[PDB]
Design an enzyme around this catalytic site. Structure first.
Site, PDB file in Angstrom:
ATOM      1  N   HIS A 129      -4.255  -4.167  -1.221  1.00 52.31           N
ATOM      2  CA  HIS A 129      -4.093  -3.489  -2.086  1.00 52.31           C
ATOM      3  C   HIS A 129      -3.397  -3.656  -3.257  1.00 52.31           C
ATOM      4  O   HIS A 129      -3.707  -3.527  -4.875  1.00 52.31           O
ATOM      5  CB  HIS A 129      -3.815  -2.058  -0.889  1.00 52.31           C
ATOM      6  CG  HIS A 129      -4.318  -1.614   0.009  1.00 52.31           C
ATOM      7  ND1 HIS A 129      -5.522  -1.097  -0.509  1.00 52.31           N
ATOM      8  CD2 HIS A 129      -4.440  -1.895   2.148  1.00 52.31           C
ATOM      9  CE1 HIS A 129      -5.881  -0.966   1.053  1.00 52.31           C
ATOM     10  NE2 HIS A 129      -5.189  -1.123   1.744  1.00 52.31           N
ATOM     11  N   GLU A 169       0.830  -1.140  -0.189  1.00 52.44           N
ATOM     12  CA  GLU A 169       0.018  -0.184   0.314  1.00 52.44           C
ATOM     13  C   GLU A 169       1.155   1.375   0.019  1.00 52.44           C
ATOM     14  O   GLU A 169       1.096   2.345   0.332  1.00 52.44           O
ATOM     15  CB  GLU A 169      -1.030   0.463   1.014  1.00 52.44           C
ATOM     16  CG  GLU A 169      -1.608   1.448   1.847  1.00 52.44           C
ATOM     17  CD  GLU A 169      -3.219   1.168   2.938  1.00 52.44           C
ATOM     18  OE1 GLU A 169      -2.023   0.418   3.061  1.00 52.44           O
ATOM     19  OE2 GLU A 169      -3.933   1.993   2.656  1.00 52.44           O
TER      20      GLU A 169
END
Ligand SMILES: *[C@@H]1O[C@H](CO)[C@@H](O[C@@]2(O)O[C@H](CO)[C@@H](O)[C@H](O)[C@H]2NC(C)=O)[C@H](O)[C@H]1NC(C)=O
Ligand SMILES: *[C@@H]1O[C@H](CO)[C@@H](O)[C@H](O)[C@H]1NC(C)=O
Ligand SMILES: *[C@@H]1O[C@H](CO)[C@@H](O)[C@H](O)[C@H]1NC(C)=O
Ligand SMILES: *[C@@H]1O[C@H](CO)[C@@H](O)[C@H](O)[C@H]1NC(C)=O
Ligand SMILES: *[C@@H]1O[C@H](CO)[C@@H](O)[C@H](O)[C@H]1NC(C)=O
Ligand SMILES: *[C@@H]1O[C@H](CO)[C@@H](O)[C@H](O)[C@H]1NC(C)=O
Ligand SMILES: *[C@@H]1O[C@H](CO)[C@@H](O)[C@H](O)[C@H]1NC(C)=O
Ligand SMILES: *[C@@H]1O[C@H](CO)[C@@H](O)[C@H](O)[C@H]1NC(C)=O
Ligand SMILES: [Zn+2]
Ligand SMILES: [Zn+2]
Lengths: 497, 497
Positions: free
Chosen positions: A364, A339
């Site tokens: 993510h 992320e």
């Protein structure tokens, strides 16, 4: 070799057709009713894109959610996605997935709730049965008294909401850096931590997650939770197994009440700011809950901001401990990983360790497109990437959502599920806002209902239901899908099209 | 047990990370011991700036707006090393935007018969007129010599001219905060200079300044887009494109004869894609003729002007296919700007499909390429280099944080890439050093060092359109400059032992 325009057309359409088949949803064959809805969606998508492009004005689905939220909600594509069954939301945090309005209109109207203004001029909320809390850097006052003396209760309540939401102003403007917006995001959790850990408020808040997700036509959730430290009015502090049981009882009652809802399962999360020796205990804790709550407790995750905190490699002996036992214990992992905008750093290299540790899904994976070998492992093993686009925009990874790094993942048919992460923090719906921006920004103008259907099916097929549960859930989802298609043809006057 | 020990885990981890290193741009280079000494210094510097940004939670300056990063990068060791480094070639440049605005001011606007006016949008415009002031069509033309003399402050007058023309006077990301707004300002820049820079002696001397400035930034070769047409004399005579080409050919030949350490220049004819197909057809036939009669100086054809709102390649397809359809076929090389866009699945990014079907020799930008896996295969298979212009892509609205630049995933897959500067004069960039700095700091990882730079530098000669003899000679030259650069750098940064 194109002597006529037909040979050029044919090669052109062959190449474009190959990409359309390759991307997410490309092998879906829509039925006649679906095709009629698909053609309406595609007409709508082309109209908004061609107006942006040819009339030289901003593409609203890709601007800050602060600006786009009120604009998308009136459009047909948004209303279709709102009505559409979503399947599952697989990436959620339990203290960030119900409405701030409920915290204000319900939780802060309960007895013994206190408020104070901290040294950064934010309101904080907590519960104390045993008198007012001590004035440790902020002066606590009873909310009931402050509200009754405000002279305008509607304004008082709105002020509470405005002081807690990250969508009160545009975060891209007010907190215009990664460290500033994470400062504001961390502060939000500090504002609510006290009140949201009081046991009956936490119980009811979790019930509100399920109510809100069901209301957005989501039938199943998997939720990250720290589980531990819920406290009663008399000061009793509960352990993580109690917190898990509390969620289990709420989920069972909810599914009893609403058999059109598949239910919920829980991932234990720990903040990646703690020493390795404490992570070790949380791994041991998770091994125990995994063995004794099969089918409700899923495994373990590390959370809190990825960039400045501890890498997976910094915890590697804790994370390898289950696999090293005799006999081995396979504790599933759901790592938040990559992320970040960094490349070649220990942050994006968390993706390597997530794969080496056999992560079931990855949270993510924003940096994944910079890692071609990790991409191929993700594809070959079927490790779904949990994509949370509003979160990634508001929390500093991208500004124009057409630059979202999951768009190249979808174009290669990397397995992806869409989710909302912390929708309550910035006033998003459970899934419809994130699904809309994924649909409008992370796939192309010529991508229609087949992409939506594949993403929806992905959220069940890459859930952590066992095979029998998935079949049951897909039967329920198919019935929801068929009703949605018929309803949509009538609603958008497409039936004879 | 898969990883019973740390050594088993790190072995697998390092093999996976190493295999990605082998696959990125430059990953097959083996540095010699001197190069390794410089590389270790570069990597120490790179790790220091990245780890400070990450762990001290502050913005990564190499990735912010060029308006903010330009002065900060120039004082750092990595920039100073790249400044000294031989760049090889700049393969993507526009001839009216590749020398200094300072020279337009200090040289061109000090010539006889130069006039200025303020237009209805309150921008200065410059032109030449041998027959008194021009007709006052939408502005009042005044003689620059008189305005400067009556200014009361000549240095301030010249500084104001520069400030009124440059896109870096303010931060374009702040002052023109949308694609349409900044392209409005960009289009206006060319309108401001169009009159003065099409006057034949000025255009000749400006082109010479391109060669001098690029040589001074250690660039040994350039390929330049030019419309070629419309250069005009004091008496109003307007020349045709072939004259423009011959004028550049003579300037280039004199420059190479003066500077044997410079490889030279070749020209690509560009036409703006706002014109009717009849105009492009005429410019295709002109390009066929110039390609036949100026081999090894005239390279081929390109379409320019803003890609998003204007005519697609398919919109000109009958003109573009005409050379191949002759009997016998004529092979007019194409250097299409293509996919300079955030759009996906539209007419604009699908220009990449047509660029390849038409056998482009290189493609300009390909910002949308990472969204098109089947086009990526053709680009790699055919060796079609992608001309990456990172500062241009940021300032002209495709990306904010340059770590989100869409060429970073291309470089990680070893898509053939050359770095270039596009319109460095417009926003006060150096010929190559600023764009190479941001590519090196934003488009590859923390652990990517001198091998990336060396590969990108070699790529710019390897994917030039030099013939076999020229290319062998230029690579021997580049090798010599590179050896001198490594030796000089070891001394300058005190790295010898
Ligand atoms: C949270 O609430 C604070 C208290 O009202 C508010 O403080 C100020 O800044 O708000 C007003 C502007 O809206 C200003 O007129 C007052 O002077 C401030 N009040 C105090 C006591 O300093 C904060 O701005 C609010 N913070 C957010 C993020 O909404
Ligand atoms: C493209 O190149 C191929 C291979 O050289 C050739 O056969 C074909 O005719 C070319 N097409 C065009 C449109 O020039
Ligand atoms: C641009 O806007 C005008 C009116 O504002 C409208 O008529 C026209 O169709 C628009 N163009 C597109 C492609 O939407
Ligand atoms: C809050 O929710 C609870 C349980 O869901 C309900 O009994 C009550 O009426 C609501 N309001 C307050 C202030 O408790
Ligand atoms: C990962 O999974 C494979 C196959 O499922 C298994 O053999 C291996 O031991 C696992 N590794 C870890 C670290 O759990
Ligand atoms: C952070 O900044 C401090 C100075 O305030 C410096 O001592 C330290 O080395 C920095 N940390 C990193 C990793 O650069
Ligand atoms: C402008 O450049 C020309 C061409 O080199 C040169 O002859 C002339 O002196 C220059 N003007 C000034 C003011 O330097
Ligand atoms: C250009 O000059 C005019 C006149 O001084 C000034 O008002 C205007 O803002 C300037 N524009 C820019 C973009 O610098
Ligand atoms: Zn999350
Ligand atoms: Zn260009």
């Amino acid at each position: 070799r194109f002597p006529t325009m037909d040979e050029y057309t044919n090669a052109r359409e062959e190449l474009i057709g190959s990409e359309q088949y390759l991307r997410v949803g490309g092998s879906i064959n829509l039925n006649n009713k679906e095709k009629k809805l698909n053609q309406f969606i595609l007409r709508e998508k082309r109209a908004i894109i061609e107006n942006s492009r040819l009339n030289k004005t901003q593409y609203i689905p890709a601007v800050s959610f602060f600006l786009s939220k009120s604009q998308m909600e009136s459009t047909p594509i948004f209303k279709i996605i709102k009505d559409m069954p979503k399947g599952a939301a697989l990436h959620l945090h339990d203290t960030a997935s119900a409405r701030i309005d409920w915290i204000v209109s319900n939780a802060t109207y309960r007895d013994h709730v206190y408020m104070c203004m901290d040294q950064d001029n934010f309101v904080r909320l907590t519960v104390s049965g045993t008198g007012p809390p001590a004035n440790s850097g902020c002066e606590w006052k009873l909310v009931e008294t402050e509200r009754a003396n405000s002279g305008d209760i509607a304004a008082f309540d709105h002020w509470l909401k405005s002081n807690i939401s990250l969508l009160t102003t545009d975060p891209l403007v007010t907190y215009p850096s990664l460290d500033k917006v994470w400062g504001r995001f961390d502060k939000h959790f500090s504002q609510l931590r006290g009140i949201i850990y009081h046991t009956p408020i936490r119980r009811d808040y979790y019930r509100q997650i399920l109510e809100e997700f069901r209301s957005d036509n989501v039938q199943y959730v998997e939720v990250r939770s720290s589980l531990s430290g819920y406290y009663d009015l008399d000061g009793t502090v509960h352990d993580p197994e109690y917190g898990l049981q509390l969620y289990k009882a709420v989920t069972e009652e909810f599914v009893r009440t609403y058999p059109d809802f598949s239910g919920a399962k829980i991932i234990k999360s720990t903040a990646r700011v703690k020493p390795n020796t404490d992570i070790f205990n949380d791994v041991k804790l998770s091994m125990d809950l995994y063995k004794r709550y099969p089918g409700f407790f899923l495994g373990f995750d590390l959370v809190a901001q990825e960039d400045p905190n501890t890498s997976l490699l910094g915890y590697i002996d804790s994370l390898l401990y289950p696999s090293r036992q005799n006999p081995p214990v396979s504790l599933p992992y759901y790592f938040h990983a990559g992320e970040t905008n960094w490349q070649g750093t220990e942050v994006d290299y968390n993706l390597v360790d997530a794969l080496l540790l056999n992560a079931t899904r990855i949270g993510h994976g924003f940096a994944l497109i910079k890692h071609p070998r990790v991409i191929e492992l993700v594809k070959s093993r079927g490790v779904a990437v949990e994509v949370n686009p509003v979160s990634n925009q508001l929390l500093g990874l991208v500004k124009d959502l057409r630059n979202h790094a999951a768009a190249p993942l979808l174009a290669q048919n990397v397995p992806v599920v869409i989710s909302s992460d912390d929708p309550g923090v910035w006033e998003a719906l459970p899934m419809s806002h994130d699904m809309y921006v994924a649909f409008m920004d992370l796939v192309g103008e010529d991508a229609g209902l087949d992409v939506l259907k594949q993403l929806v099916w992905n959220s069940i097929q890459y859930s952590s239901m066992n095979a029998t549960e998935k079949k049951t859930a897909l039967k329920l989802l198919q019935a929801k899908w068929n009703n949605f298609i018929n309803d949509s043809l009538i609603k958008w006057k497409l039936t004879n099209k």
